[PDB]
Amino acid sequence: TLWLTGICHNEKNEVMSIDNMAGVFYMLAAAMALSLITFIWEHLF
Amino acid sequence: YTANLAAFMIQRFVDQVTGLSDKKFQRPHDYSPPFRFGTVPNGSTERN
Amino acid sequence: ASVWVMMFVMLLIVSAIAVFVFEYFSPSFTIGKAIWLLWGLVFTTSKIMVSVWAFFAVIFLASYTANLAAFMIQRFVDQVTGLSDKKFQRPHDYSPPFRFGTVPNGSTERNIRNNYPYMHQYMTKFNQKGVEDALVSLKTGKLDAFIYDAAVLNYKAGRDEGCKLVTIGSGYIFATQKGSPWKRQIDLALLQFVGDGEMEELE
Amino acid sequence: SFMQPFQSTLWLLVGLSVHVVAVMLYLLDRFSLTLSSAMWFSWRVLLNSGIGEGSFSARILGMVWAGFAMIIVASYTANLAAFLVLDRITGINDPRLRNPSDKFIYATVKQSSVDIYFRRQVELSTMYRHMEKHNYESAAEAIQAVRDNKLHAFIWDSAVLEFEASQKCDLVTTGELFFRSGFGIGMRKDSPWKQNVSLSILKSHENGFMEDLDKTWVRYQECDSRSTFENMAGVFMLVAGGIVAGIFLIFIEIAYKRHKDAR
Amino acid sequence: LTLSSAMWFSWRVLLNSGIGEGSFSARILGMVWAGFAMIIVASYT
């Protein structure tokens, strides 16, 4: 108690502070592929 | 789910180096830039 | 206050711009449709431009959601100020009449006899024998609050279960052997202890 | 408060995504409206001025983009709540005073009782090279030292500091009452009038003459508690300049396109 | 407009399914009620 503590003893959950999570970078890879699902079905019947 | 996503991205803390298990120490020139670690000479951890 | 007048000014500006833009769709009523669309978007060439201002209005909605989250979270209130209230002084002039007792033959009772004997005419209807009497009459609501040596109330106030039992204010204290040679010894010793803070260690 | 804190590259990504929405809503029209329609549908749905209606798979993708728009609005309003609602010298127990630094120098006035309370205790040993080498002649010099931001904190008697904190917006009395003593009277030992004066002191405590000086000199003043903004004023400036530039381009573009149509 | 119209306008604006259009002072009061609805949504969220 005399000698140790500085500021890391009072660490306060250093999260992020804007954000760049992955998210939509997955989702866009679905969405255009959805057109690749659909617009090959040219109804030539 | 605004309240839920407020619970997610506030309640992230992360780190990079695990320790000697990393090849950061073991293969520093196999990662660019090469890694930068020094010690005080003639120490105990240097003997280790 | 001043944000309101800014809103009036900006709505007048956008309404006049809408008047001229309807004047140049002439190559359906700014008296009608444009106003109620401004109302709907706070809460066709320039219509995308006004939907941009609707997006701004949503941003102002979000900013005052954050503001009202700052208001109603960052209320704490109290009821009794103290002897200045007529709660103590005129208890039967408020229904229900007020409920305060003391331990008899005390110092604060001498102080209120010096202050108000009529207050004692009320208090002697409610006097006690112990401090656990006060604990029960607060936790069962039999007596409203208490006037004592407020230090004992400061000990056992935090020692309550749940501590909804609020004492007098935030520490607002009211009532603010002869010839022994020990007196110099005791008082210089107490100067040493207060100068060393061992009373704070007992605290 | 500020301008946009949200990583302006991300705002550029938002604008490019709006143009991607425009490209998707015009190129998929031809599978069964290609001039100025889907621009205003993109500014209808992406501004959320209209979320509703106006082949199948293109509109499936469009309402997926509307889902993106709602999620982005939810995330940015969550950030507006976060970065406005989310996240000092407390006393001798601080390492700023247990290990006193030169970025944190503190002082008093020499020949005072406050310096006596410093010099009595033992654990203030590192403090004496600040509290005896930097001192003043008046407490108003320490007040100005706060006001000139010379020294960060000061240690004085409680009442005057609480008064001056209730006067102006530079002062907060922090920490407990350090060295809890009483305020007495300078009386010689052979003075026979310690007696009835202290009886009058007992009368002052018992009959509230202490509380009378609390009314007549102590309890008068307060300050505010920070309870039409800089973000708002930035919105006024940006929206005003945007409306001026937009209107003065309306005339040019509509004039050239009306004379295109006159051809 | 006195049979079943303003019921569905109340469930259009107060549910915020449609905030927009559909004499003067009654509609001024109605958009004041829409302001109330938006403030109540903001407070509950």
From Swiss-Prot, chain B:
Q: Which residues are glycosylated?
A: N42
In the record, the effect of K24N is given as: In FESD; no effect on localization to the cell membrane; changed glutamate-gated calcium ion channel activity characterized by increased glutamate and glycine potency
Self-association or partners: how does it assemble?
Answer: Heterotetramer. Forms heterotetrameric channels composed of two GluN1/zeta subunits (GRIN1), and two identical GluN2/epsilon subunits (GRIN2A, GRIN2B, GRIN2C or GRIN2D) or GluN3 subunits (GRIN3A or GRIN3B) (in vitro). Can also form heterotetrameric channels that contain at least two GluN1 subunits and at least two different GluN2 subunits (or a combination of one GluN2 and one GluN3 subunits) (in vitro). In vivo, the subunit composition may depend on the expression levels of the different subunits. Found in a complex with GRIN1, GRIN3A and PPP2CB. Found in a complex with GRIN1 and GRIN3B.
Domain note: Contains an N-terminal domain, a ligand-binding domain and a transmembrane domain. Agonist binding to the extracellular ligand-binding domains triggers channel gating. A hydrophobic region that gives rise to the prediction of a transmembrane span does not cross the membrane, but is part of a discontinuously helical region that dips into the membrane and is probably part of the pore and of the selectivity filter.
What exactly does this protein do? Component of N-methyl-D-aspartate (NMDA) receptors (NMDARs) that function as heterotetrameric, ligand-gated cation channels with high calcium permeability and voltage-dependent block by Mg(2+). NMDARs participate in synaptic plasticity for learning and memory formation by contributing to the slow phase of excitatory postsynaptic current, long-term synaptic potentiation, and learning.
Family that this chain belongs to: Belongs to the glutamate-gated ion channel (TC 1.A.10.1) family. NR2A/GRIN2A subfamily.
Q: Which organism is it from?
A: Homo sapiens
Swiss-Prot record, chain D:
Q: Where are the transmembrane segments?
A: 8-28, 57-77, 231-254
- Chain ranges on the Extracellular side, renumbered to this chain: 78-230
The observed outcome of changing P5R is:
In NDHMSD; changed localization to the cell membrane; loss of glutamate-gated calcium ion channel activity
* Outcome of swapping G50R: In NDHMSD; loss of function in calcium ion transmembrane import into cytosol
What is known to happen upon mutating V73M?
A: Increase in glutamate and glycine agonist potency; mutant channels are activated lower glutamate and glycine concentrations
Describe the effect of F83C.
In NDHMSD; likely pathogenic; changed glutamate-gated calcium ion channel activity; mutant channels are activated at 13-fold lower glutamate concentrations and 9-fold lower glycine concentrations
Residue intervals annotated with topology Cytoplasmic: 48-56
Annotated effect of mutating M70I: In NDHMSD; likely pathogenic; may affect glutamate-gated calcium ion channel activity; decreased sensitivity to magnesium block
Give the disulfide map. C169-C223
Assembly with partners or alone: Heterotetramer; the NMDAR subunits are modular and harbor tiered domains that function in concert to regulate opening and closing of the cation-selective ion channel pore. Forms heterotetrameric channels composed of two GluN1/zeta subunits (GRIN1), and two identical GluN2/epsilon subunits (GRIN2A, GRIN2B, GRIN2C or GRIN2D) or GluN3 subunits (GRIN3A or GRIN3B) (in vitro). Can also form heterotetrameric channels that contain at least two GluN1 subunits and at least two different GluN2 subunits (or a combination of one GluN2 and one GluN3 subunits) (in vitro).
The entry marks the following residues as binding glycine, namely S113, D157
Instruction: Relate the outcome reported for changing M70V.
Output: In NDHMSD; likely pathogenic
Intramembrane residue segments, as ranges: 37-47
What is the similarity comment for this entry? Belongs to the glutamate-gated ion channel (TC 1.A.10.1) family. NR1/GRIN1 subfamily.
The identity of this protein, by name, is Glutamate receptor ionotropic, NMDA 1
Q: Which residues are glycosylated?
A: N99, N196
**Species this chain originates from:** Homo sapiens
The shown residues of the full protein are 553 to 844 of 938
Q: Where is this region: Pore-forming?
A: 35-54
Curated annotation (Swiss-Prot), chain E:
Where found in the cell? Cell membrane; Postsynaptic cell membrane; Postsynaptic density membrane; Synaptic cell membrane
Q: Which residues cross the membrane?
A: 25-45
Outcome when changing A42S? In NDHMSD; uncertain significance; no effect on glutamate-gated calcium ion channel activity
Describe the effect of Y44S: In NDHMSD; likely pathogenic; decreased ion transmembrane transport; reduced localization to cell membrane; changed glutamate-gated calcium ion channel activity; mutant channels are activated at 50-fold lower glutamate concentrations and 28-fold lower glycine concentrations
Q: What is the effect of changing M38I?
A: In NDHMSD; likely pathogenic; may affect glutamate-gated calcium ion channel activity; decreased sensitivity to magnesium block
Outcome (variant: G18R): In NDHMSD; loss of function in calcium ion transmembrane import into cytosol
Q: What is the effect of changing I39T?
A: In NDHMSD; uncertain significance; changed glutamate-gated calcium ion channel activity; mutant channels are activated at 2-fold higher glutamate and glycine concentrations
Q: Which residues lie within the membrane without crossing it?
A: 5-15
Q: Extract the ranges annotated as region (Pore-forming).
A: 3-22
Swapping G35V leads to an effect described as:
In NDHMSD; likely pathogenic; changed glutamate-gated calcium ion channel activity; mutant channels are activated at 2-fold lower glutamate and glycine concentrations; decreased sensitivity to magnesium block; reduced localization to cell membrane
Q: What is the effect of changing A34V?
A: In NDHMSD; uncertain significance; may affect glutamate-gated calcium ion channel activity; decreased sensitivity to magnesium block
How this protein is processed and modified after translation, per its record? NMDA is probably regulated by C-terminal phosphorylation of an isoform of GRIN1 by PKC. Its phosphorylated state is influenced by the formation of the NMDAR-PPP2CB complex and the NMDAR channel activity.
Q: Which residues lie on this side of the membrane: Cytoplasmic?
A: 16-24
Taxonomy, superkingdom: Eukaryota
The UniProt entry's sequence similarity note says: Belongs to the glutamate-gated ion channel (TC 1.A.10.1) family. NR1/GRIN1 subfamily.
Give the protein's recorded name.
Glutamate receptor ionotropic, NMDA 1
For this protein's source organism, the top of the classification is:
Eukaryota, Metazoa, Chordata, Craniata, Vertebrata
- The stretch of the full-length protein covered here is 601 to 648 of 938
